[PDB]
Ligand binder design. Structure first.
Ligand SMILES: [Ca+2]
Ligand SMILES: [Ca+2]
Lengths: 462, 241
């Protein structure tokens, strides 16, 4: 490949000390730059820009200009959009030129010439008196009638999840173990091998912020948006190639807040585990551009897990940033569900059998036995309820399971009340009414249970 | 003006989530955001000396920045803070004219000895967050309140505590070494979920009591005695459930 960088050139005429590399300037000059003999090379760039309702002001930064250079810019709307104002300022905000509306009043143009040793310019386009405009800019190109701007550095990102290690249903947070990777290109980080005799330079056990502060160069630092407390990190390394290609690697264990949890439909609920990585720099410096899948996003492990992942996705977006501008965001989302067989077999079948015991006793015609069995079955129900109390999260609000337990307990107690009434009726000599009540209860109870189940399904799952 | 004047500070606070309440030690934990803004000509700089329009400090407290630049700044603390405070996105940035602002995302635990649980579960409580300046009132004073977001944010799903109303106010309190310091207070009025307690406790209790009431219609007193004895055991079982 070729190479890039700055250089120092020493030329001598009949001065044998030059080949030592230490020749100090002397005598009268004899050579000059060749490019000065011809017209300077022009650079031209065109951009399409749009001023949304909340984004009526736009600014762009230019590359450095050498003394004697010239700058030209013009703006022409795509359609019937009104002509915006155009102006040019340096990096401090000092005005240098203002746009002039042409006599065929469809465009605005600007011109400037460089006096200082180094000039850094900013182009302002504003319509704050879906409009879309065409912006044309050139250096040493007066023929604009018939890259100049700086470009953001592109970052590649990737993330993999190894294990979900905990979920807190009262404080609404979860913890995850995984791996993160970043990669970008920066010519300012390049070095010359002959000064170190090596091809790879590395930094270990340091955050990107610390390395950036040590080498005094801007780097794409990041943070987890919903991080709770400190983060544990292993195998943290940064290494750079002579061309300037850099990469970051980290293995992390972190706890993330998740206020989006909703446990109303427990245990039939479905949840989302979202992991957000945000750059700590403005979008005009660094931006996420590509997604790399270095491993499986969701890793398989031996044995069963409490949460089963159904699907996942990865996406890049932009979010508002402090001190204006914008910062990039990388999001990983996992869709998870619980193990249904566990809850069904552990809770619902025994509950059904307990309910059946209280239902079947109405076939008896000896009401004392019916009363005694109902009284015993209520105690059995309460004992089973606290036995399963361990799988009953205390959240401060009702779930589906709590409502079902309450309804079942109420019906079980009403059975005892009806049994007492039937016993009294049989004692007074009205056995026919007791038999009619038995038939009514035997018909009605399963209908009530089925109707309650239908109502719950309608009100919670559709 | 002949006499020196205090610098005017604008403050704002937002609550994102209440993450826990301790009823025995009487404290609670909250997640939110804090913002400060003030103007000081001594912080001004010349753009041509940096080639920039904004100067920033990151991951540092106001006290540390004040000690680094050797100028007085409006430091602050949480009055009832328990233990260390977790902070994210901490930044201070200044404009050439001298306008400065502070930003912080925090998670903190605050003591609350004012809790009163006598009327449980029908009790109502106040969650109060107090921010005090660590400087005398003749140097810095809170002047205005900024509502940069909703004061109490909405979250998907139900919460254990329901916020009924809120308020924000600025006052003055006595300070060490005399004088006075400013205080900014945010108060949330909260209550519990009543349907949960009513349906989970009172209806089953009513049915259990009715079982012991109905048995007096019987004229076979052995059956009445046996059913009463069983119902007492059922009552104890439900109580420990
Ligand atoms: Ca929630
Ligand atoms: Ca108290």
């Amino acid at each position: 490949t070729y190479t890039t960088g700055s250089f120092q050139l020493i030329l001598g005429l009949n001065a044998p000390q030059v080949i030592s590399g230490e020749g100090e300037p002397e005598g009268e000059v004899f050579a000059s730059l060749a490019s000065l003999e011809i017209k300077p090379e022009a650079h031209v760039q065109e951009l399409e820009i749009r001023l949304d309702k909340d984004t009526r002001y736009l600014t762009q930064h230019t590359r450095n200009l050498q003394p004697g250079d010239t700058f030209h810019a013009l703006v022409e709307p795509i359609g019937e959009a009104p002509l915006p104002r155009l102006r040019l300022t340096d990096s401090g905000g000092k005005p240098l030129a203002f746009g002039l509306i042409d006599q065929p009043g469809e465009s605005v143009e600007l011109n400037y010439t460089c006096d200082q040793d180094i000039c850094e310019l900013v182009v302002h386009v504003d319509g704050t008196d879906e409009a879309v405009y065409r912006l044309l800019v050139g250096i040493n190109a007066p023929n604009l009638r018939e890259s100049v701007f700086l470009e953001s550095d592109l970052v590649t990102v990737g993330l993999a999840v190894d294990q979900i290690v905990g979920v807190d249903q009262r404080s609404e947070n979860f913890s995850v173990v995984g791996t993160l990777k970043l990669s970008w290109h920066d010519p300012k980080l390049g070095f010359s091998p002959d000064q170190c005799g090596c091809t790879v330079k590395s930094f270990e056990d340091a955050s990107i912020r610390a390395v950036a502060g040590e080498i005094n160069l801007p780097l794409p630092s990041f943070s987890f948006y919903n991080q709770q407390g400190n983060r544990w990190s292993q195998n943290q390394v940064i290494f750079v190639t002579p061309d300037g290609r850099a990469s970051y690697f980290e293995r992390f264990t972190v706890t993330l807040q998740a206020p989006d949890f909703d446990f109303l439909a427990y245990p039939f609920d479905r949840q989302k585990f979202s992991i957000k990585v945000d750059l700590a720099v403005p979008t005009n410096m660094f931006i996420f551009n590509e997604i790399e899948r270095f491993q499986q996003v969701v890793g398989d492990q031996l044995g069963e897990e409490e949460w089963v992942v159904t699907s996942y996705s990865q996406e890049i977006t932009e979010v508002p940033f402090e001190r204006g501008s914008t910062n990039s965001r990388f999001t990983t989302t996992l869709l998870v569900k619980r193990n249904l067989e566990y809850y069904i077999l552990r809770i619902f079948v025994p509950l059904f059998l307990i309910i059946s015991v209280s239902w079947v006793i109405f076939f008896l015609k000896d009401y004392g036995r019916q009363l005694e069995v109902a009284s015993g079955n209520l105690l059995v129900f309460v004992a089973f309820n606290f036995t399963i109390s361990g799988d009953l999260p205390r959240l401060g609000y009702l779930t589906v399971l709590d409502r079902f337990m309450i309804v079942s307990f109420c019906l079980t107690a009403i059975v005892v009340l009806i049994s007492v009434c039937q016993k009294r009726l049989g004692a007074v000599g009205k056995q026919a009414v007791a038999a009619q009540i038995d038939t009514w209860v035997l018909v009605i109870y399963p209908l009530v249970y089925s109707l309650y189940i239908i109502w719950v399904y309608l009100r919670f799952f559709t």
